[PDB]
Amino acid sequence: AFELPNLPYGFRALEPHIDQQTMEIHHDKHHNTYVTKLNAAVEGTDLESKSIEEIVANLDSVPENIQTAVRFNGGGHLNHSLFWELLTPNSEEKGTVVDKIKEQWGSLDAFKEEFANQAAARFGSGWAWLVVNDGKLEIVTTPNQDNPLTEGKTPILGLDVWEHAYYLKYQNKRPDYISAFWNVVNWEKVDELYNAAK
Amino acid sequence: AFELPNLPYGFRALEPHIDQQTMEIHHDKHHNTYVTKLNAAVEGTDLESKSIEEIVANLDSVPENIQTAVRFNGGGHLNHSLFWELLTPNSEEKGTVVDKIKEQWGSLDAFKEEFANQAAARFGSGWAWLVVNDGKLEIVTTPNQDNPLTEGKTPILGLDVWEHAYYLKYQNKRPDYISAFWNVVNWEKVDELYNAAK
Ligand SMILES: [Mn+2]
Ligand SMILES: [Mn+2]
């Protein structure tokens, strides 16, 4: 069965960029619910033995009778599993992907500007992503717990823009949350996701 | 043409069921944004001089270049316009629709249970509605700022289940918010919307 992964740092470690109370609820409540409901959906079926990456990549072929529960809770589980590892108290803006960003956009600042614009323009619940699409870097957003993996695009950076991810600290000010995010991006994890990209 | 309606009560009037900070941001920031963006979408079109009820009811007829902008911001304006008028510090569980609820569900409690299940189960951003469909009462939910008007079903009660509507006070506990909602329902406005229902 699927398990709630521990955070790789304390609940306070991303302060003041993300508040401890949000990290605790977002992990212990929101992610845990996705794991509970994912397990209920796949329990005693062949899906129970697969990686969450494989299930979401192959979501469009999951049996119709559970496909929605797997979309929501499988997506939820994968997206938050990625997110916790893509955050760090020791962010360093360097490495393979930062170098590739600088060459494609001209500066990290120009990339951050486009990412912030795409992330702010996601209407309702969802995620902003940096993806590898056919060997090119592309910024896309997805609704609810959808993941670009499902459409053959490998996510290497994600930002949760569900209001639960930012409302306690930022309320309506999603752009201020996006600004604070840059301070805690784990570019080592971004590089790892980019290198593993098929 | 379109204007941010003033609340029928002070920001503090719905305490302790809905916190004053939420009432203030939700109206002054979230609703105001929908009005700004709506005005920008319809500036120099026939829509300028239509009611928002007519625009949303006939969404499928809006020019396609601006239809999504009108779905989002037109929806946002109508939904929040209804919501403010459907809340009150003087909630009385009686009248035309309460009687019709008791007759159809057997009890207000039975009706609340269906509304609570539908409202809690709506995944991502959206609204839970009591509507008139072919003269009968139905509970439905919509995503984002979609409104049942567009589907020819008349909304007479709505609950905002976007996380911005409840996160500051209730965080993940959407059911506790839904439960607190009953204390501030304006059943007089519910009756008025029902009586108008065409
Ligand atoms: Mn989340
Ligand atoms: Mn709202």
Coordinates of C-alpha atoms and ligand atoms in Angstrom, one line a residue:
Chain A
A1 CA 0.0 0.0 0.0
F2 CA 1.0 3.7 -0.5
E3 CA 2.5 5.6 2.5
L4 CA 2.7 9.3 3.6
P5 CA 6.4 10.1 3.1
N6 CA 8.0 12.1 6.0
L7 CA 9.1 15.7 5.2
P8 CA 12.9 15.8 4.6
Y9 CA 13.1 18.8 7.2
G10 CA 11.1 20.1 10.2
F11 CA 7.7 21.7 9.8
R12 CA 9.3 25.1 10.6
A13 CA 12.3 24.7 8.3
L14 CA 10.7 26.7 5.3
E15 CA 9.8 29.8 7.5
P16 CA 9.3 32.5 6.8
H17 CA 8.5 31.5 3.1
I18 CA 5.9 28.8 4.1
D19 CA 4.4 28.9 7.7
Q20 CA 4.8 25.8 10.0
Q21 CA 1.0 25.6 10.5
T22 CA 0.5 25.2 6.7
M23 CA 3.3 22.6 6.4
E24 CA 1.7 20.6 9.2
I25 CA -1.9 20.7 7.8
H26 CA -0.8 20.4 4.1
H27 CA 1.3 17.2 5.0
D28 CA -0.5 15.6 8.0
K29 CA -4.1 16.3 6.8
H30 CA -4.3 17.1 3.0
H31 CA -1.5 14.6 1.7
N32 CA -2.6 11.9 4.3
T33 CA -6.2 12.1 2.9
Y34 CA -4.9 11.6 -0.7
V35 CA -2.9 8.5 0.6
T36 CA -6.0 7.1 2.5
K37 CA -8.3 7.5 -0.5
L38 CA -5.7 6.3 -3.0
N39 CA -5.2 3.1 -1.0
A40 CA -9.1 2.6 -0.8
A41 CA -9.3 3.1 -4.6
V42 CA -6.6 0.5 -5.6
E43 CA -6.9 -1.9 -2.5
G44 CA -6.8 -5.6 -3.5
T45 CA -6.3 -4.7 -7.2
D46 CA -3.2 -4.9 -9.5
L47 CA -2.7 -1.1 -9.2
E48 CA -1.7 -1.6 -5.4
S49 CA 1.7 -3.0 -6.5
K50 CA 2.7 -0.2 -8.9
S51 CA 4.8 3.0 -8.4
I52 CA 2.6 6.2 -8.1
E53 CA 4.7 7.6 -11.1
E54 CA 3.6 4.6 -13.3
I55 CA -0.1 4.9 -12.2
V56 CA -0.3 8.7 -13.0
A57 CA 1.7 8.4 -16.3
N58 CA -0.8 5.7 -17.3
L59 CA -3.9 7.4 -15.7
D60 CA -5.8 7.6 -19.1
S61 CA -5.8 3.7 -19.1
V62 CA -6.7 3.1 -15.4
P63 CA -10.1 1.2 -15.2
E64 CA -13.0 3.8 -15.8
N65 CA -14.7 2.7 -12.5
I66 CA -11.8 4.0 -10.3
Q67 CA -10.0 6.4 -12.8
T68 CA -11.5 9.6 -11.2
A69 CA -10.5 8.5 -7.6
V70 CA -7.0 7.7 -8.9
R71 CA -6.8 11.0 -10.8
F72 CA -7.7 13.0 -7.6
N73 CA -5.9 10.9 -4.9
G74 CA -3.1 9.4 -7.1
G75 CA -2.4 12.9 -8.5
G76 CA -2.6 14.3 -4.9
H77 CA -0.1 11.7 -3.7
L78 CA 2.4 12.1 -6.6
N79 CA 2.2 16.0 -6.6
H80 CA 2.7 16.4 -2.8
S81 CA 5.5 13.6 -2.8
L82 CA 7.3 15.7 -5.5
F83 CA 6.6 19.1 -3.7
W84 CA 8.1 18.1 -0.3
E85 CA 11.3 17.0 -2.0
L86 CA 11.4 20.1 -4.3
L87 CA 11.5 22.4 -1.2
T88 CA 14.5 22.9 1.1
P89 CA 15.8 25.3 3.8
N90 CA 19.2 25.3 1.9
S91 CA 18.2 26.5 -1.7
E92 CA 21.1 27.2 -4.1
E93 CA 20.3 28.6 -7.6
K94 CA 22.8 26.6 -9.6
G95 CA 23.1 23.2 -11.4
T96 CA 22.1 21.5 -14.6
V97 CA 18.6 22.9 -14.9
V98 CA 19.5 26.4 -13.7
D99 CA 22.2 26.5 -16.4
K100 CA 19.7 25.3 -19.1
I101 CA 17.1 27.9 -17.8
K102 CA 19.7 30.8 -18.1
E103 CA 20.5 29.7 -21.8
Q104 CA 16.8 29.2 -22.9
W105 CA 15.2 32.3 -21.1
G106 CA 18.5 34.5 -21.0
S107 CA 18.3 34.8 -17.2
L108 CA 16.8 33.0 -14.1
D109 CA 14.8 36.3 -13.6
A110 CA 13.1 36.0 -17.0
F111 CA 12.2 32.3 -16.3
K112 CA 10.8 33.3 -12.8
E113 CA 8.7 36.0 -14.4
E114 CA 7.1 33.6 -16.9
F115 CA 6.6 30.9 -14.2
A116 CA 5.0 33.5 -11.9
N117 CA 2.7 34.8 -14.7
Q118 CA 1.6 31.2 -15.7
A119 CA 1.2 30.2 -11.9
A120 CA -1.0 33.4 -11.2
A121 CA -3.2 32.7 -14.4
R122 CA -4.2 29.1 -13.2
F123 CA -7.9 29.8 -12.5
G124 CA -9.2 27.8 -9.4
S125 CA -7.2 24.9 -7.9
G126 CA -4.0 23.4 -9.5
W127 CA -0.2 23.4 -10.0
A128 CA 2.4 25.3 -12.0
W129 CA 5.1 23.1 -13.5
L130 CA 8.5 23.3 -15.3
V131 CA 8.4 20.2 -17.5
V132 CA 10.7 18.5 -20.1
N133 CA 8.6 18.2 -23.3
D134 CA 10.4 16.3 -26.1
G135 CA 13.8 17.6 -24.7
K136 CA 12.7 21.3 -24.4
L137 CA 11.9 23.1 -21.1
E138 CA 8.3 24.3 -21.0
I139 CA 6.1 26.0 -18.3
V140 CA 2.5 24.7 -18.0
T141 CA -0.2 24.7 -15.3
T142 CA -2.7 21.9 -14.6
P143 CA -6.1 21.9 -12.8
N144 CA -6.8 20.2 -9.4
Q145 CA -4.3 17.2 -9.0
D146 CA -3.6 16.6 -12.7
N147 CA 0.1 16.0 -13.5
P148 CA 1.9 16.6 -16.8
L149 CA 3.3 12.9 -16.6
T150 CA -0.2 11.8 -17.8
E151 CA 0.3 13.7 -21.1
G152 CA 3.9 12.5 -21.6
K153 CA 5.6 15.7 -20.2
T154 CA 8.1 15.1 -17.3
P155 CA 7.7 17.5 -14.3
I156 CA 11.0 18.7 -12.8
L157 CA 9.6 21.6 -10.7
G158 CA 6.1 22.1 -9.3
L159 CA 4.3 24.8 -7.2
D160 CA 1.0 24.0 -5.4
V161 CA -1.4 26.9 -6.1
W162 CA -4.4 25.4 -4.4
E163 CA -5.4 28.1 -1.9
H164 CA -4.7 25.7 1.0
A165 CA -1.0 26.0 0.1
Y166 CA -0.8 29.8 0.7
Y167 CA -4.0 31.2 2.2
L168 CA -2.9 31.2 5.9
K169 CA 0.2 33.4 5.2
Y170 CA -0.6 35.2 1.9
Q171 CA -4.5 35.1 1.7
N172 CA -5.4 36.5 -1.8
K173 CA -1.8 37.5 -2.6
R174 CA -0.8 34.4 -4.7
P175 CA 2.0 36.4 -6.5
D176 CA 3.7 37.1 -3.0
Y177 CA 3.6 33.3 -2.3
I178 CA 5.2 32.6 -5.8
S179 CA 8.0 35.2 -4.9
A180 CA 8.7 33.5 -1.5
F181 CA 8.7 30.0 -3.2
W182 CA 12.0 30.9 -5.1
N183 CA 13.8 31.1 -1.6
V184 CA 13.1 27.4 -0.9
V185 CA 13.4 25.7 -4.3
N186 CA 15.6 22.5 -4.1
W187 CA 17.4 22.8 -7.5
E188 CA 19.3 19.5 -6.6
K189 CA 15.9 17.7 -6.7
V190 CA 15.0 19.6 -10.0
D191 CA 18.3 18.4 -11.5
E192 CA 17.6 14.8 -10.3
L193 CA 14.0 14.8 -11.9
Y194 CA 15.5 16.4 -15.2
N195 CA 18.3 13.7 -15.4
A196 CA 15.9 10.8 -14.8
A197 CA 13.6 12.3 -17.6
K198 CA 12.8 9.6 -20.3
Chain B
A1 CA -20.9 49.1 -16.3
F2 CA -20.5 46.3 -13.6
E3 CA -20.0 47.4 -10.0
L4 CA -18.9 45.7 -6.8
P5 CA -22.1 45.5 -4.8
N6 CA -21.7 46.6 -1.1
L7 CA -22.4 43.9 1.6
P8 CA -25.9 44.0 3.2
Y9 CA -24.1 44.0 6.6
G10 CA -20.6 44.8 8.2
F11 CA -17.6 42.6 7.8
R12 CA -18.1 41.4 11.4
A13 CA -21.8 40.7 11.1
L14 CA -21.5 36.9 10.4
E15 CA -19.1 36.2 13.4
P16 CA -18.4 33.7 14.7
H17 CA -19.6 31.5 11.8
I18 CA -17.5 33.4 9.1
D19 CA -14.5 35.5 10.4
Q20 CA -14.4 39.3 9.6
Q21 CA -10.9 39.1 7.8
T22 CA -12.4 36.5 5.3
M23 CA -15.5 38.7 4.7
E24 CA -13.3 41.7 4.1
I25 CA -10.7 40.0 1.7
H26 CA -13.4 37.8 0.0
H27 CA -15.5 41.0 -0.9
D28 CA -12.8 43.8 -1.2
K29 CA -10.2 41.7 -3.0
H30 CA -11.6 38.4 -4.6
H31 CA -15.0 39.8 -5.7
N32 CA -13.4 43.2 -6.7
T33 CA -10.9 41.3 -9.0
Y34 CA -13.8 39.5 -10.8
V35 CA -15.5 42.9 -11.4
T36 CA -12.3 44.6 -12.8
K37 CA -11.6 41.6 -15.1
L38 CA -15.3 41.3 -16.2
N39 CA -15.4 45.0 -17.1
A40 CA -12.2 44.6 -19.1
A41 CA -13.7 41.6 -21.0
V42 CA -17.0 43.3 -22.0
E43 CA -15.7 46.9 -22.5
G44 CA -17.1 47.9 -26.0
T45 CA -19.5 44.9 -26.5
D46 CA -23.3 44.4 -26.2
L47 CA -22.6 42.7 -22.8
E48 CA -21.8 46.2 -21.3
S49 CA -25.6 46.8 -21.1
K50 CA -26.8 43.3 -20.1
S51 CA -27.6 42.1 -16.5
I52 CA -25.0 39.6 -15.2
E53 CA -27.9 37.1 -14.8
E54 CA -28.6 37.2 -18.6
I55 CA -24.8 37.0 -19.5
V56 CA -24.2 33.9 -17.3
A57 CA -27.6 32.2 -18.3
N58 CA -26.5 32.7 -22.0
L59 CA -22.7 32.0 -21.5
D60 CA -22.7 29.7 -24.6
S61 CA -23.7 32.8 -26.7
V62 CA -20.9 35.2 -25.5
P63 CA -18.2 35.8 -28.2
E64 CA -15.7 32.9 -28.0
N65 CA -12.6 35.3 -27.9
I66 CA -13.9 36.5 -24.4
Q67 CA -16.3 33.5 -23.4
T68 CA -13.8 31.9 -20.9
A69 CA -12.9 35.4 -19.4
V70 CA -16.7 35.9 -18.9
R71 CA -17.3 32.3 -17.6
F72 CA -14.6 33.0 -14.9
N73 CA -15.2 36.7 -14.0
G74 CA -18.9 36.9 -15.0
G75 CA -19.4 33.7 -13.0
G76 CA -17.3 35.2 -10.1
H77 CA -19.4 38.4 -10.1
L78 CA -22.8 36.7 -10.2
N79 CA -21.9 33.9 -7.7
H80 CA -20.5 36.4 -5.0
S81 CA -23.4 38.8 -5.7
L82 CA -25.8 36.0 -4.8
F83 CA -23.6 34.8 -1.9
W84 CA -23.5 38.1 0.0
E85 CA -27.4 38.5 -0.2
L86 CA -27.8 34.8 0.8
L87 CA -26.0 35.4 4.1
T88 CA -27.4 37.3 7.1
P89 CA -26.8 37.9 10.8
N90 CA -30.6 37.4 11.3
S91 CA -31.1 33.8 9.9
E92 CA -34.6 32.3 10.5
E93 CA -35.2 28.6 9.4
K94 CA -38.7 29.2 8.1
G95 CA -40.6 30.4 4.9
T96 CA -41.6 29.2 1.4
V97 CA -38.5 27.1 0.5
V98 CA -37.9 25.7 4.1
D99 CA -41.5 24.3 4.0
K100 CA -40.9 22.9 0.4
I101 CA -37.6 21.3 1.7
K102 CA -39.4 19.7 4.7
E103 CA -42.1 18.3 2.2
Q104 CA -39.5 16.9 -0.3
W105 CA -36.7 15.7 2.1
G106 CA -39.0 15.0 5.1
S107 CA -36.9 17.3 7.4
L108 CA -34.5 20.3 7.1
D109 CA -31.8 17.9 8.6
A110 CA -32.2 15.4 5.7
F111 CA -31.8 18.3 3.2
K112 CA -28.7 19.6 5.2
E113 CA -27.1 16.0 5.1
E114 CA -27.4 15.9 1.2
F115 CA -26.1 19.5 0.9
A116 CA -23.2 18.7 3.3
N117 CA -22.2 15.5 1.4
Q118 CA -22.4 17.3 -2.1
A119 CA -20.5 20.4 -0.7
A120 CA -17.8 18.3 1.0
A121 CA -17.3 16.0 -2.0
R122 CA -16.8 18.8 -4.6
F123 CA -13.1 18.3 -5.5
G124 CA -11.0 21.5 -6.0
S125 CA -12.6 25.0 -6.2
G126 CA -16.4 25.5 -6.7
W127 CA -19.9 26.0 -5.3
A128 CA -22.7 23.9 -3.7
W129 CA -26.2 25.0 -4.8
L130 CA -29.9 24.4 -4.1
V131 CA -31.6 24.9 -7.5
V132 CA -35.1 24.8 -9.1
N133 CA -35.0 22.2 -12.0
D134 CA -38.4 21.8 -13.9
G135 CA -40.2 23.1 -10.8
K136 CA -38.4 20.7 -8.4
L137 CA -35.6 21.3 -5.8
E138 CA -32.2 19.7 -6.5
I139 CA -28.7 19.9 -4.8
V140 CA -25.8 20.2 -7.4
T141 CA -22.2 21.4 -7.2
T142 CA -20.2 23.3 -9.9
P143 CA -16.5 23.8 -10.5
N144 CA -14.6 27.1 -10.2
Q145 CA -17.1 30.0 -11.0
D146 CA -19.6 27.9 -13.1
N147 CA -23.3 28.7 -12.2
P148 CA -26.3 26.4 -12.7
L149 CA -28.1 29.3 -14.5
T150 CA -26.1 28.4 -17.7
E151 CA -27.6 24.9 -17.6
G152 CA -31.1 26.4 -17.2
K153 CA -31.3 25.5 -13.5
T154 CA -32.2 28.5 -11.1
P155 CA -29.9 28.9 -8.1
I156 CA -31.8 29.9 -4.9
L157 CA -29.0 29.0 -2.3
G158 CA -25.2 28.8 -2.9
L159 CA -22.2 28.0 -0.6
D160 CA -18.7 29.1 -1.8
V161 CA -16.4 26.0 -1.2
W162 CA -13.3 27.7 -2.7
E163 CA -10.6 27.3 0.1
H164 CA -10.4 31.2 0.3
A165 CA -14.0 31.1 1.6
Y166 CA -13.1 29.0 4.7
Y167 CA -9.3 28.4 5.1
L168 CA -8.5 31.3 7.6
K169 CA -11.1 30.0 10.2
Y170 CA -11.5 26.2 9.4
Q171 CA -8.4 25.3 7.3
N172 CA -8.9 21.7 6.0
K173 CA -12.2 21.3 8.0
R174 CA -14.6 22.2 5.1
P175 CA -17.4 20.1 6.8
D176 CA -17.2 22.4 10.0
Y177 CA -17.5 25.5 7.6
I178 CA -20.6 23.9 5.9
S179 CA -22.1 23.2 9.3
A180 CA -21.4 26.8 10.5
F181 CA -23.0 28.1 7.2
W182 CA -26.6 27.0 8.4
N183 CA -26.4 29.7 11.2
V184 CA -26.2 32.5 8.6
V185 CA -28.5 31.4 5.7
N186 CA -30.8 34.3 4.5
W187 CA -33.9 32.1 3.9
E188 CA -35.8 35.4 2.9
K189 CA -33.4 35.8 -0.1
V190 CA -33.8 32.0 -0.8
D191 CA -37.6 32.6 -0.9
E192 CA -37.2 35.7 -3.2
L193 CA -34.9 33.7 -5.7
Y194 CA -37.4 30.8 -5.7
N195 CA -40.4 33.1 -6.2
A196 CA -38.6 34.8 -9.2
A197 CA -37.6 31.3 -10.6
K198 CA -38.6 31.3 -14.4
Ligands
MN1 MN -1.8 20.8 -1.8
MN2 MN -15.3 33.1 -3.4

